[PDB]
Design an enzyme around this catalytic site. Structure first.
Site, PDB file in Angstrom:
ATOM      1  N   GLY A  87       6.810  90.179  93.012  1.00  0.00           N
ATOM      2  CA  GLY A  87       7.235  88.994  93.475  1.00  0.00           C
ATOM      3  C   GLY A  87       7.512  87.937  92.489  1.00  0.00           C
ATOM      4  O   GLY A  87       7.509  88.146  91.067  1.00  0.00           O
ATOM      5  N   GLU A 107      13.435  91.168  96.955  1.00  0.00           N
ATOM      6  CA  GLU A 107      14.947  90.354  96.884  1.00  0.00           C
ATOM      7  C   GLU A 107      15.224  90.688  95.243  1.00  0.00           C
ATOM      8  O   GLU A 107      14.283  90.700  94.537  1.00  0.00           O
ATOM      9  CB  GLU A 107      15.071  89.182  97.804  1.00  0.00           C
ATOM     10  N   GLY A 160       5.122  86.179 100.273  1.00  0.00           N
ATOM     11  CA  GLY A 160       4.828  87.130 101.054  1.00  0.00           C
ATOM     12  C   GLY A 160       4.869  88.859 100.306  1.00  0.00           C
ATOM     13  O   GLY A 160       4.060  89.501 100.813  1.00  0.00           O
ATOM     14  N   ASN A 201      -2.396  76.895  90.097  1.00  0.00           N
ATOM     15  CA  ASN A 201      -1.115  76.029  89.782  1.00  0.00           C
ATOM     16  C   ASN A 201      -1.430  74.570  89.415  1.00  0.00           C
ATOM     17  O   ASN A 201      -0.592  74.030  88.823  1.00  0.00           O
ATOM     18  CB  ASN A 201       0.097  76.314  90.882  1.00  0.00           C
ATOM     19  N   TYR A 221       8.503  75.808  86.394  1.00  0.00           N
ATOM     20  CA  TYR A 221       7.976  77.181  86.326  1.00  0.00           C
ATOM     21  C   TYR A 221       8.068  77.595  84.783  1.00  0.00           C
ATOM     22  O   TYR A 221       6.985  78.097  84.552  1.00  0.00           O
ATOM     23  CB  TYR A 221       8.530  77.973  87.329  1.00  0.00           C
ATOM     24  N   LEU A 224     -10.173  98.301  79.367  1.00  0.00           N
ATOM     25  CA  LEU A 224     -10.497  97.708  80.831  1.00  0.00           C
ATOM     26  C   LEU A 224     -11.736  97.666  81.381  1.00  0.00           C
ATOM     27  O   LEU A 224     -12.206  96.673  82.116  1.00  0.00           O
ATOM     28  CB  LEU A 224      -9.219  98.196  81.694  1.00  0.00           C
ATOM     29  N   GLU A 231     -14.752  97.596  79.981  1.00  0.00           N
ATOM     30  CA  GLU A 231     -15.640  96.522  79.299  1.00  0.00           C
ATOM     31  C   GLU A 231     -15.368  95.013  80.019  1.00  0.00           C
ATOM     32  O   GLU A 231     -16.321  94.435  79.841  1.00  0.00           O
ATOM     33  CB  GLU A 231     -15.542  96.579  77.822  1.00  0.00           C
TER      34      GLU A 231
END
Ligand SMILES: Nc1nc2c(ncn2[C@@H]2O[C@H](COP(=O)(O)OP(=O)(O)OP(=O)(O)O)[C@@H](O)[C@H]2O)c(=O)[nH]1
Ligand SMILES: Nc1nc2c(ncn2[C@@H]2O[C@H](COP(=O)(O)OP(=O)(O)O)[C@@H](O)[C@H]2O)c(=O)[nH]1
Ligand SMILES: [Mg+2]
EC number: 3.6.5.-
Lengths: 421, 155, 428
Positions: free
Chosen positions: C10, C62, C135, C197, C215, C243, C245
């Site tokens: 996304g 998109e 979405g 955010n 952004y 990963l 750990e």
């Protein structure tokens, strides 16, 4: 989500439709021959939304049962820009009769209109959906326009259906069958459209007469308010942006309940043919609404505010937070963060600063109750029912249309009184 | 039956047929199945000359149909100003009340026939008359935000 | 190697991914075309011609955001087949992302991930970047996570998840999307780093003096924190070497797998001659709420794990002295079943700042990763917004009409209620 297919039906639909194309063409730098002569790259970025590239040609279908409206539109400033094969016109009009529009004359022309819609839709890369301009008070725009809506929804169920629906008022026409035509149409709009902008001739007349001090408003005066509104509410679809950028994202932010999809548009400044706090307060003022309803008589379910021109974003954010915090009692507490704001740098024609409001307010029930009271006054005396029943229609359709509009009013009242608790 | 033919001719605006039917003994005060008379139909369909002819030949200006509608209620509802004036000139009951508690003033107010509202008030329309929901014409104008109408109703 | 594959889903996932790979390239001396005049082999493959290519996939429903990657500064960095786009987005609807639109590209995405996985001799697993509110970020991520759990049963999956803030939100339904994705991803994620955010926005306003953060501003700050977390994987570190750990050190139980990140110092680039902060000072800054990636109050909660990841000119004895000071502070309470301690990682390279960035170069920085019960307050805020709308069934019709059953709202909400209880039972 790129192409929108525009359909304009009947006298009002075509008049407001032609003005819409003149206004957005000047904003996008398209001249009356389809050539681009603008001086900004943002004008062409999302031009595919409303125009086919041949030279740019409107993705517009022009419909009427009355041929006179062909000539009127072609004679206009941008009349020759439209695709000649997209004019689908009859010979005998509808005579302000919804039944003639929906069942007889309109039913005979509808397949020729759908052939053109199909041709325009098969040429779309990613069809967003449909935009229809029409009045609810006449016969063609209301009767045939709602027939077209029903047939498009069954053939394109996955597409968004949006309308610009002009509501009748005794102040502008005063032909007593308009409440019938409009009630029979709202019935169809509740079920088959995703989003409807309510353009109320009662409000347009009051703005011209009381605010703009125009002693005898013309359709040109009313249409100047309509075109400014249509430009404003489609800004987010036509220029780059991240809020309500397409018809579906707009619907998902604005429509919490599928039937409550009738929006009250508003605009500032109101002018006849400005600072950030002024734009913000005027945008939300009852006097600036294009639907004749007082927003302070109901509650906002959702709101989209679009500011246009060069201005301070921190000033827009402060003024928008101020209205919600000041007037907390007019926004439902059970839809958190229900006011969204956009700012487009390109301003509308003849202005440096502008603001468009789109409200999904429970106060829109005042419009439906006004139409309902007129419908009922007429229907109780069975006045002119024969004109409808002799054109392939039943009297039970009147009672069902009356019942559906009063259930719509009841649903708004339910959410107006609802509490988070 | 000349009564049925007169009712249809008054509705259709057939002036010469109304004249021929009346010359053959047509009942000027004939009623259809719902109690509407040739005068109610001429008033509804805006046929001023037929309204005048019927009133000159014994039509009951205050006849009621099954729902209590008088010709004045129907001319006020549809918005036929000259007919409202002819009916009032010939003794129409300005404050006639139908089965919904409506008076001609309520109907002209609901439909936004502002000139008719003014004439009815000048001829003594009752500003205090309430419909079956307790509403006067002034309540209708306040409740629906019709400011031009509310001003008119207050003179 | 011990390879890691990064997946960006996304708009938020893609744009944060852009900022992360930009920063990683600078940290490792890689040019935007993959050339360089190694530890980072975990994150970049090497072609026959000396080109260093990110082990990264970018997916969006998109094309607009991924089209900018395809024409920008990093147009030649990524494998072009690992930039995947659909035509029609999820319209801020989890259901469209997970069901009706997402099902059209899911097989292509998995086949393209397999191509990356086939170039790995010892794949550790996946790092998944996405928003909670979108979405695609919500629905497509949960669909992908379910499929990766079936297709890579023994591989770890870590998330970098953007938690919504009203200051930059584009949808009213983001609380629904947030809860639906949290419910459906919970069993498939081993550790998830939430980025609020609003926390990042406040830092930009208060520390970087940016009145209206974009952004791009938020993403360069987020990328600095992500880099601090992944540096151990890219620089052959002694702490969080693989990963698995992250789970051992930060997640004592599978469900309470949401560590709080706190980062210091964040200084404006306009302050090019700022006096440098010591190890003691930056370590103290890890317990100041203003530096947190999620708005919550750890002083009221309890710690289940705490790890301090230092970068730059940091002497181990100075870290040990700073930790001893921290251990004598009434506001830091550990659960009684965990060792009351702090794991330490030190990376000796100076922290990197991007040209175009808003941050000053600093001599030493730290990222604290703490599994605190205080983060339950972020779930409680989301759950409250969800409850206000769901009581009236507001917007539910949009989801039910896009391949979802209404019962999934209440199933997701009760799983969130069970999560709030899990936190309440661990610390009181
Ligand atoms: N930090 C950060 N947040 C972002 C960014 N882009 C979007 N967001 C946030 O992500 C949420 C919106 O989701 P998006 O990622 O834009 O949506 P999407 O995943 O592309 O999904 P659809 O567009 O609905 O298909 C909101 O909370 C935004 O504030 C970004 O670049 N950085
Ligand atoms: N605002 C506006 N209303 C119009 C216009 N033309 C007609 N109307 C309204 O539309 C209704 C009559 O419908 P109309 O479009 O003329 O009939 P149709 O051709 O059968 O669809 C009435 O409510 C008129 O006031 C116009 O240009 N602008
Ligand atoms: Mg998106």
């Amino acid at each position: 989500m790129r192409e929108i297919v525009h359909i304009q039906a009947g006298q009002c639909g075509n008049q407001i439709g032609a003005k819409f194309w003149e206004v957005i063409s000047d904003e996008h730098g398209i001249d009356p021959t389809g050539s681009y002569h603008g001086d900004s790259d943002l004008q062409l970025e999302r031009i595919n939304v409303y125009y086919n590239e041949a030279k740019y040609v409107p993705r517009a279908i022009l419909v009427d049962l009355e041929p006179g409206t062909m000539d009127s539109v072609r004679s206009g400033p941008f009349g020759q820009i439209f695709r000649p094969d997209n004019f689908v016109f009859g010979q005998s009009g509808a005579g302000n009769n919804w039944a003639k529009g929906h069942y007889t004359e309109g039913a005979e022309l509808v397949d020729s209109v759908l052939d053109v819609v199909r041709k325009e839709s098969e040429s779309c890369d990613c069809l967003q959906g449909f935009q229809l301009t029409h009045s609810l008070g006449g016969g063609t725009g209301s009767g045939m326009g709602t027939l077209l809506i029903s047939k498009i929804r069954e053939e394109y169920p996955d597409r968004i259906m949006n309308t610009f629906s002009v509501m009748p008022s005794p102040k502008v026409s005063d032909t007593v069958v308009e409440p019938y035509n409009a009630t029979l149409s709202v019935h169809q709009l509740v079920e088959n459209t995703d989003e409807t902008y309510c353009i109320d001739n009662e409000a347009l007349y009051d703005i011209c007469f009381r605010t703009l001090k125009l002693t005898t408003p013309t359709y040109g005066d009313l249409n100047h308010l309509v075109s400014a509104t249509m430009s404003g509410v489609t800004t987010c679809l036509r220029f780059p942006g991240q809020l309500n950028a397409d018809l579906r994202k707009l619907a998902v932010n604005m429509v919490p309940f599928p039937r409550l999809h009738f929006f009250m548009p508003g605009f500032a400044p109101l002018t006849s043919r400005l600072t950030v706090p002024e734009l913000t307060q005027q945008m939300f003022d009852s006097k600036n609404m294009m639907a004749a309803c007082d927003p302070r008589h109901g509650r906002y379910l959702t709101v989209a505010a679009i500011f246009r021109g060069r201005m301070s974003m921190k000033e827009v954010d402060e003024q928008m937070l101020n209205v919600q915090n000041k007037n907390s009692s007019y926004f439902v507490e059970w839809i958190p963060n229900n006011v969204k704001t956009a700012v487009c740098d390109i301003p509308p024609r003849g202005l440096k600063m502008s603001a468009t409001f789109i409200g999904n307010s429970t106060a829109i029930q005042e419009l439906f109750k006004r139409i309902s009271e007129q419908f009922t006054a007429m229907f109780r005396r069975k006045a002119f029912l024969h004109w409808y029943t002799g054109e392939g229609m039943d009297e039970m359709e009147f009672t069902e249309a009356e019942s559906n509009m009063n259930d719509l009013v009841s649903e708004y009242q339910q959410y107006q009184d609802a509490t988070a608790d | 039956d000349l009564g049925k033919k007169l009712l249809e001719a008054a509705r259709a605006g057939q002036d010469d047929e109304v004249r021929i039917l009346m010359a053959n003994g047509a009942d000027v005060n004939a009623t259809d199945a719902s109690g509407l008379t040739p005068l109610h139909l001429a008033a509804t369909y805006g046929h001023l000359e037929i309204v005048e002819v019927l009133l000159k030949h014994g039509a009951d200006v205050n006849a009621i149909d099954i729902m209590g509608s008088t010709p004045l209620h129907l001319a006020a509802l549809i918005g036929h100003l000259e007919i409202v004036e002819v009916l009032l000139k010939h003794g129409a009951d300005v404050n006639a009340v139908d089965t919904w508690g409506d008076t001609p003033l309520h109907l002209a107010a609901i439909m936004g026939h502002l000139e008719i509202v003014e004439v009815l008030l000048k001829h003594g329309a009752d500003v205090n008359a309430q419909d079956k929901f307790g509403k006067t014409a002034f309540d209708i104008s306040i409740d629906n935000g019709n400011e031009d109408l509310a001003e008119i109703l207050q003179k | 190697m011990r390879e890691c594959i990064s997946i960006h889903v996304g708009q938020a996932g893609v744009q944060i991914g852009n900022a992360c790979w930009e920063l990683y390239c600078l940290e490792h001396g890689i040019q935007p075309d993959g050339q360089m005049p190694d530890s980072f082999n975990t994150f970049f493959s090497e072609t026959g011609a000396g080109k260093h290519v990110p082990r990264a996939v970018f997916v969006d429903l998109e094309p607009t955001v991924i089209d900018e990657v395809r024409t920008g500064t990093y147009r030649q960095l990524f494998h072009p087949e690992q930039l995947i786009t659909g035509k029609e987005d999820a319209a801020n609807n989890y259901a469209r992302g997970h069901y009706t639109i997402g099902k059209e590209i899911i097989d292509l995405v998995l086949d393209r991930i397999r191509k990356l996985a086939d170039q790995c001799t010892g794949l550790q697993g996946f790092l998944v970047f996405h928003s909670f509110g979108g979405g695609t970020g919500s629905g497509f991520t949960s669909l992908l996570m379910e499929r990766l759990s079936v297709d890579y049963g023994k591989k770890s999956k870590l998330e970098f998840s953007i938690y919504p803030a009203p200051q930059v939100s584009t949808a009213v339904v983001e609380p629904y999307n947030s809860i639906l994705t949290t419910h459906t991803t919970l069993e498939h994620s081993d550790c998830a780093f939430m980025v609020d955010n609003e926390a990042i926005y406040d830092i930009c306003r208060r520390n970087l003096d940016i009145e209206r953060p974009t952004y791009t501003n938020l993403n360069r700050l987020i990328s600095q924190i992500v880099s601090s977390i992944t540096a151990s994987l890219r620089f052959d570190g002694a702490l969080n070497v693989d990963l698995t750990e992250f789970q051992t050190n930060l997640v004592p139980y599978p469900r309470i797998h949401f560590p709080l990140a706190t980062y210091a110092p964040v200084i404006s680039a306009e302050k090019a001659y700022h006096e440098q902060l010591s190890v003691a000072e930056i370590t103290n800054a890890c317990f100041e709420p203003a530096n947190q990636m999620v708005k919550c109050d750890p002083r009221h909660g309890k710690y289940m794990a705490c790890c301090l990841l230092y970068r730059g000119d940091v002497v181990p004895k100075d870290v040990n002295a700073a930790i001893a000071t921290i251990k004598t502070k009434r506001s830091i309470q550990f659960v009684d079943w965990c060792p009351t301690g702090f794991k330490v990682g030190i990376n000796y390279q100076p922290p990197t700042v991007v040209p175009g960035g808003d941050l000053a170069k600093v001599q030493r920085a730290v990222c604290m990763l703490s599994n605190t019960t205080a983060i339950a307050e972020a779930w409680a805020r989301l759950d409250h917004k969800f409850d206000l709308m769901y009581a009236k069934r507001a917007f539910v019709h949009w989801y039910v009409g896009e391949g979802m059953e209404e019962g999934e709202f209440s199933e997701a909400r009760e799983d969130m209620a069970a999560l709030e209880k899990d936190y309440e039972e661990v610390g009181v």
